[PDB]
Design an enzyme around this catalytic site. Structure first.
Site, PDB file in Angstrom:
ATOM      1  N   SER A 101       0.842  -1.205   0.000  1.00 54.08           N
ATOM      2  CA  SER A 101       0.000   0.000   0.000  1.00 54.08           C
ATOM      3  C   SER A 101       0.879   1.258   0.000  1.00 54.08           C
ATOM      4  O   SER A 101       1.762   1.375  -0.842  1.00 54.08           O
ATOM      5  CB  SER A 101      -0.969  -0.030   1.190  1.00 54.08           C
ATOM      6  OG  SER A 101      -2.195   0.605   0.854  1.00 54.08           O
ATOM      7  N   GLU A 125       0.415  -4.293  -3.893  1.00 57.88           N
ATOM      8  CA  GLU A 125      -0.828  -3.501  -3.980  1.00 57.88           C
ATOM      9  C   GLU A 125      -0.567  -2.014  -3.731  1.00 57.88           C
ATOM     10  O   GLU A 125      -0.943  -1.441  -2.692  1.00 57.88           O
ATOM     11  CB  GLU A 125      -1.889  -4.080  -3.037  1.00 57.88           C
ATOM     12  CG  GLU A 125      -2.261  -5.526  -3.454  1.00 57.88           C
ATOM     13  CD  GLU A 125      -3.611  -6.022  -2.928  1.00 57.88           C
ATOM     14  OE1 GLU A 125      -4.163  -5.463  -1.946  1.00 57.88           O
ATOM     15  OE2 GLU A 125      -4.115  -7.007  -3.512  1.00 57.88           O
ATOM     16  N   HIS A 241      -5.051  -7.691   0.947  1.00 55.71           N
ATOM     17  CA  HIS A 241      -4.170  -6.546   1.176  1.00 55.71           C
ATOM     18  C   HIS A 241      -3.147  -6.761   2.288  1.00 55.71           C
ATOM     19  O   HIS A 241      -2.211  -5.979   2.436  1.00 55.71           O
ATOM     20  CB  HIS A 241      -5.020  -5.324   1.510  1.00 55.71           C
ATOM     21  CG  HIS A 241      -4.382  -4.011   1.170  1.00 55.71           C
ATOM     22  ND1 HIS A 241      -3.858  -3.733  -0.078  1.00 55.71           N
ATOM     23  CD2 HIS A 241      -4.213  -2.888   1.909  1.00 55.71           C
ATOM     24  CE1 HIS A 241      -3.390  -2.497  -0.088  1.00 55.71           C
ATOM     25  NE2 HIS A 241      -3.600  -1.959   1.101  1.00 55.71           N
TER      26      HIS A 241
END
Ligand SMILES: C[C@H](O)CCCC(=O)CCC/C=C/c1cc(O)cc(O)c1
Ligand SMILES: C[C@H](O)CCCC(=O)CCC/C=C/c1cc(O)cc(O)c1
Ligand SMILES: [K+]
Ligand SMILES: [K+]
EC number: 3.1.1.-
Lengths: 267, 266
Positions: A101, A125, A241
Site C-alpha cells: 500500500s 498492492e 491486502h
C-alpha cells in the site's frame, strides 16, 4: 527479538523491532503503520539467516511521537526519507525492503531514490488512483472514521477475517487510534505520489511486485499492467491486502526466497 | 427477433437468433452454450444499427442435434471452425465477434485463423490454465455434475446472483442438461488449446480484451499479463464471468462502442 525506540533528527521517535543476524531485510508497514502485523513473519524470516527490522510508522501506533508534517500530506517520497532516517540511525547500510500500500509506494521510492542503499524491493498492492470514498472519510469525526475503516479492513480487504480479528485487542486498539490519522494524511496525497509514472525508470530494477490472489481484479489491475509494461516480475500472494496477516508462513517464504534470489544475482 | 434453425454440413443443426440490420455482430456463448443469456443485449445492440446474430453451441441447449466430436475433446480451433460454418450458412461475410471463456478462446482463434472474416474480436476471461477441480467433475455422475456446477455458477462466478436466477426456469432446465456435456468435453481440452502462445501473433490485431472487475485477481491474472505484453487493449467490465447476464446494458454499450471504434478505424 529487540523491541525498543530510537529518535531521528527529523523529530520522530520510532518504535522498532529487530531480530536475527545476516543480510538486512526491512518490513515497512502499510498505511496503518502497525508493525505487530509482522510478528510471526519476522521470526520465520530471521530464522533463515537474516537480520529483520520493522517499525511503526510516524504518527501511528508506538511511533506517534512525531512532528505533524510526518503524518499529514503524506507522500511516498516523504515516507522514503523517513525510512532512510531510521535505517541511518540503526546503521543499516544495505537493505532488502518490503512494503504494501503506502508502504509499496515507499519502497519503490526508496529503490529509485537511494539505489546504493536498497538491494531489492518487494511491493504489494501499490495505490495509484484517488478513491473518493476513502478520501471523503477525512472530514468525519474521529470515532466515525475508526468505526467505518475498522469495518472496511475486516470485511473488504483483510483477506482473512479470522486472522485479522486474531491480531487481538491490543493491536486493534492501536489501529482504532490510527484510522483518523491515516484518513486525514494519506488517501488524498499518497496515490498522486506513486513513483510509477515513469515506466522506463522501473525497467531493469530489482523490483518484485505482487497483488493479492483474492483481491477483486479492479483494485490493483493497474499494478499488473504497469509491472508488465516495465518488464518487472509480477505475481500473486494468497489473500488480499495483508498477506503478512492472513498467510504469515507463505509471506515469510516469499520474502526469504525473493531475498535469496537477489543475493545470488548480486554475486 | 428471428428465432430459427440452420443445418451445417459438419452435421450440426444450430438453434440461432438474429435481430436488426447493419454491420454484423456475432455473440458467441461461453462454454455453457446458451444464447438466451444474450436476450436483453441482442435487442439493445441491434437498435444501434447492427445485425446481431447468436446461437446455442453444438451439443448444448437447442443446438443439441450435433455429432459427438463437436462437444467432446473440444478445442478453441474446433469451435472456431464450427462458428465459421454457421457464419457461412447465414451468409455473414464480415463480422465483429464477442466471446467469453471457451467463447473467448474461440473468437481469438477466429481472428487469427480467419482474418478476412473478422472485423474485430472482443474476448472476455479466456482460460489458459488447466484447473484440476473442474477437470475432475468429468468423471462424476450427471446429476452430481449438474448440482455442483449449478452452484458454482450461481454463487461463485455469475457476478450477480439475482440476474442469474432471473434467467428463468426454462433456461436453467437447459443449463441443467448442459453441465455434464460441458464437463466432459471442455475443461480438459479448452485451456491447452488457448491461441495465446504467440504474443507476437496478437500484436497489432483488432482485439479488445476484458476481465470482470469483481473477479478474483488470480482467476484471469494471466489474461492481463498476456494482453499487456502484446500491446492489446485490456480493460474491465462490471461483474465477473457473465457480464451479459449481470450487467446487460453496460455489456451492450461496450459491444456497440467497441464495434463503432473499429468501424471508424477501418
Ligand atoms: C492499509 C492501507 O495502507 C490503509 C487502509 C486503507 C485500505 O486498506 C483500503 C484498500 C487499499 C487502499 C489503499 C489506499 C487507497 C487510497 O485511495 C489512498 C491511499 O493512500 C491508500
Ligand atoms: C461458463 C464457462 O464457459 C463454463 C463453466 C465453468 C466456469 O464458469 C468456471 C469459471 C471460468 C472457467 C472456465 C473454464 C475453466 C477451465 O479450467 C476450463 C474451461 O474449459 C473453461
Ligand atoms: K500461511
Ligand atoms: K446493466
Amino acid at each position: 527479538r529487540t523491541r525498543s525506540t530510537i529518535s531521528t533528527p527529523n523529530g520522530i521517535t520510532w518504535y522498532y523491532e529487530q531480530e536475527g543476524t545476516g543480510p538486512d531485510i526491512v518490513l515497512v508497514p502499510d498505511g496503518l503503520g502497525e508493525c505487530q502485523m509482522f510478528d510471526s513473519s519476522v521470526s520465520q524470516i530471521a530464522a533463515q539467516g537474516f537480520r529483520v527490522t520493522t517499525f511503526d510508522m510516524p504518527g501511528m501506533s508506538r511511533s506517534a511521537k512525531a512532528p505533524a508534517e510526518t503524518y499529514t500530506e503524506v507522500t511516498a517520497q516523504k515516507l522514503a526519507s523517513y525510512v532512510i532516517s531510521i535505517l541511518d540511525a540503526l546503521d543499516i547500510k544495505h537493505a532488502t525492503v518490503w512494503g504494501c500500500s503506502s508502504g509499496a509506494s515507499t519502497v519503490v521510492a526508496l529503490l529509485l531514490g537511494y539505489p546504493d542503499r536498497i538491494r531489492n524491493a518487494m511491493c504489494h498492492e501499490l495505490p495509484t488512483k484517488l478513491l473518493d470514498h476513502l478520501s471523503n472519510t477525512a472530514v468525519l469525526e474521529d470515532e466515525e472514521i475508526s468505526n467505518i475503516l475498522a469495518n472496511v479492513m475486516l470485511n473488504d480487504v483483510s483477506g482473512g477475517s479470522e486472522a485479522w480479528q486474531a491480531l487481538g485487542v491490543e493491536v486493534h486498539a492501536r489501529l482504532h487510534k490510527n484510522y483518523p490519522v491515516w484518513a486525514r494524511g494519506y488517501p488524498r496525497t499518497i496515490p498522486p505520489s506513486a513513483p510509477v509514472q515513469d515506466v522506463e525508470a522501473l525497467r531493469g530494477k530489482p523490483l518484485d511486485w505482487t497483488v493479492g490472489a483474492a483481491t477483486p481484479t479492479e483494485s490493483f489491475f493497474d499494478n499488473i499492467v504497469t509491472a508488465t509494461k516495465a518488464g518487472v516480475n509480477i505475481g500473486l500472494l494468497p489473500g488480499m491486502h495483508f498477506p503478512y496477516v492472513s498467510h504469515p508462513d507463505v509471506f515469510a517464504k516469499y520474502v526469504v526466497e525473493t531475498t535469496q534470489k537477489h543475493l545470488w544475482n548480486s554475486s
